[PDB]
Amino acid sequence: KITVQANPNMPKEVAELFRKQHYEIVGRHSGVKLCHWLKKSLTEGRFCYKQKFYGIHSHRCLQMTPVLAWCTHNCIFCWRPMENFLGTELPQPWDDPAFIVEESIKAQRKLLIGYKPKVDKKKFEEAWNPTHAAISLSGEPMLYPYMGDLVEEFHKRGFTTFIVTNGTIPERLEEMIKEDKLPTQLYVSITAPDIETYNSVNIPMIPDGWERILRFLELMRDLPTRTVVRLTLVKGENMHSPEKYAKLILKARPMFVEAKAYMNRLTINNMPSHQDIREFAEALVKHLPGYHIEDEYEPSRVVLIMRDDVDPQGTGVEGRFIKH
């Protein structure tokens, strides 16, 4: 009988929409949801590509966001129970970091209860005690003013952290850098190689997103933590100008680059084949001096490019894998 403190700072109708999609709301503006993946992992011994790529055990990932319904993009491949996001900023009052982490852990368990049957036993126990905080559910998490501190809160309770951002909020990165509160691994999602594609695919709600993204990339160079540039590829929408993507990538010189297939305006044929991704990956690596194709995972049609000076058998800020 777990209970989560909550009082959704949004129209009740919206809040109900999140619930029907199985999100567990936290506080005024956050939420938790079980990895789409996680089910088959607990019941079928399934693995995730993040495990193959970085040594991350997805079944011990607590997937959440401190910015549930606000974002700076209304992207065409962005799932959100409602029509468009509610706005470009996190409305106040803002919940504090410790409360968010605590309640999120309770939310995670509450959702887990919906299990135990055909379920693995030792694994369920580990999912009940997550060690990876995936800050990438929905919305634009960097809109939360206290990201740095949120990261520390997770770290104090032994989690390693992973932030996924669309990069339109460089000031939050400058702040985390300044107060030295960086996550274990930082991902910036890039879905457009040029300004026109950026508008038609991301559908910006702010006017200066492109320059903010350019700044974000520049702030990632030599960043003292694990870095990733993730490209979500949509057939017929953004799989072009690989040389332009390389330039964006090069401004940040991330440790890793993921060429990932995208899997509302978007048809089922907008989904590229794994073979399409391999091709795009090859075309891309050709424009990235000092990088090479390091691995792939066909089941998720994703290919991994890694910077040459990163050790394929190491861990940490200079190795392929997360500290054991």
Side-chain angles (χ1 to χ4, degrees), residues 84-95:
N84 299 95
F85 287 101
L86 283 41
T88 64
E89 303 169 320
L90 184 59
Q92 291 188 57
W94 298 318
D95 291 329

Side-chain angles (χ1 to χ4, degrees), residues 306-321:
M306 178 172 93
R307 196 179 65 213
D308 295 346
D309 59 353
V310 180
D311 186 352
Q313 239 163 47
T315 57
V317 311
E318 290 155 304
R320 162 164 171 183
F321 297 101

Side-chain angles (χ1 to χ4, degrees), residues 18 67 75 97 102 111-112 132 193 197 217 262 273 281 291 320 322:
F18 279 95
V67 183
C75 24
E102 306 294 53
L111 291 179
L112 275 178
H132 306 307
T197 305
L217 291 174
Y262 143 79
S273 71
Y291 282 79
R320 162 164 171 183
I322 247 66

Side-chain angles (χ1 to χ4, degrees), residues 72-77 191-192 197-204 213:
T72 43
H73 293 173
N74 266 137
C75 24
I76 62 173
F77 61 76
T191 51
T197 305
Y198 177 73
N199 288 318
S200 58
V201 167
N202 291 158
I203 310 189
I213 293 184

Side-chain angles (χ1 to χ4, degrees), residues 34 38 41-42 57-62 105 108-109 112 115 121-131:
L34 294 176
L38 189 275
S41 155
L42 243 51
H57 308 80
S58 288
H59 74 279
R60 303 193 74 181
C61 270
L62 191 179
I105 294 163
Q108 180 64 195
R109 284 162 182 167
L112 275 178
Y115 276 124
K121 198 64 185 176
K122 148 280 168 190
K123 194 165 293 177
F124 182 88
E125 199 83 57
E126 289 176 355
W128 189 271
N129 303 274
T131 57

Side-chain angles (χ1 to χ4, degrees), residues 104-324:
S104 288
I105 294 163
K106 303 216 245 306
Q108 180 64 195
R109 284 162 182 167
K110 171 173 178 188
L111 291 179
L112 275 178
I113 281 310
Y115 276 124
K116 207 50 53 211
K118 317 157 72 70
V119 174
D120 176 308
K121 198 64 185 176
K122 148 280 168 190
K123 194 165 293 177
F124 182 88
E125 199 83 57
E126 289 176 355
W128 189 271
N129 303 274
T131 57
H132 306 307
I135 307 173
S136 54
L137 240 206
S138 67
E140 171 41 57
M142 297 291 261
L143 286 173
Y144 180 62
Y146 314 129
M147 183 56 71
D149 285 321
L150 183 76
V151 159
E152 302 294 293
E153 284 306 312
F154 276 120
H155 290 175
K156 286 200 287 300
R157 298 165 173 69
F159 291 72
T160 45
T161 51
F162 309 75
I163 288 47
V164 169
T165 176
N166 69 16
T168 59
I169 308 158
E171 45 296 310
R172 192 75 61 249
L173 182 52
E174 293 169 333
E175 284 156 36
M176 287 158 63
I177 284 177
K178 183 191 77 179
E179 280 171 53
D180 194 52
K181 287 166 185 177
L182 306 170
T184 315
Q185 183 158 307
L186 171 73
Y187 294 74
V188 64
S189 162
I190 286 71
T191 51
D194 53 59
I195 259 167
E196 300 57 46
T197 305
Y198 177 73
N199 288 318
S200 58
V201 167
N202 291 158
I203 310 189
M205 295 160 82
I206 56 295
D208 59 330
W210 180 266
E211 17 288 307
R212 300 176 74 101
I213 293 184
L214 290 191
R215 281 203 279 293
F216 202 85
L217 291 174
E218 289 154 9
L219 285 158
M220 279 171 77
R221 199 198 273 265
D222 314 321
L223 191 74
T225 186
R226 297 164 56 84
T227 54
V228 187
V229 164
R230 173 185 292 152
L231 314 170
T232 296
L233 306 166
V234 179
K235 214 184 182 193
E237 294 293 317
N238 66 8
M239 298 195 69
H240 56 83
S241 311
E243 82 288 1
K244 287 183 173 177
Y245 279 116
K247 301 204 177 66
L248 296 178
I249 291 174
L250 285 178
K251 302 172 59 73
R253 283 209 88 82
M255 280 176 74
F256 317 98
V257 174
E258 296 174 5
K260 186 172 187 182
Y262 143 79
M263 295 172 97
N264 187 336
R265 182 162 309 210
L266 287 190
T267 131
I268 323 310
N269 318 284
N270 278 129
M271 178 186 301
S273 71
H274 183 66
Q275 196 47 236
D276 293 329
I277 282 72
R278 304 167 83 152
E279 288 177 62
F280 191 77
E282 305 189 317
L284 220 210
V285 78
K286 279 43 168 185
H287 292 278
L288 296 170
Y291 282 79
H292 64 282
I293 292 181
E294 169 68 8
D295 213 336
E296 85 185 319
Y297 200 76
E298 178 175 40
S300 305
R301 322 192 175 185
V302 51
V303 162
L304 170 71
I305 282 42
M306 178 172 93
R307 196 179 65 213
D308 295 346
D309 59 353
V310 180
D311 186 352
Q313 239 163 47
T315 57
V317 311
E318 290 155 304
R320 162 164 171 183
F321 297 101
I322 247 66
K323 287 292 183 58
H324 292 324

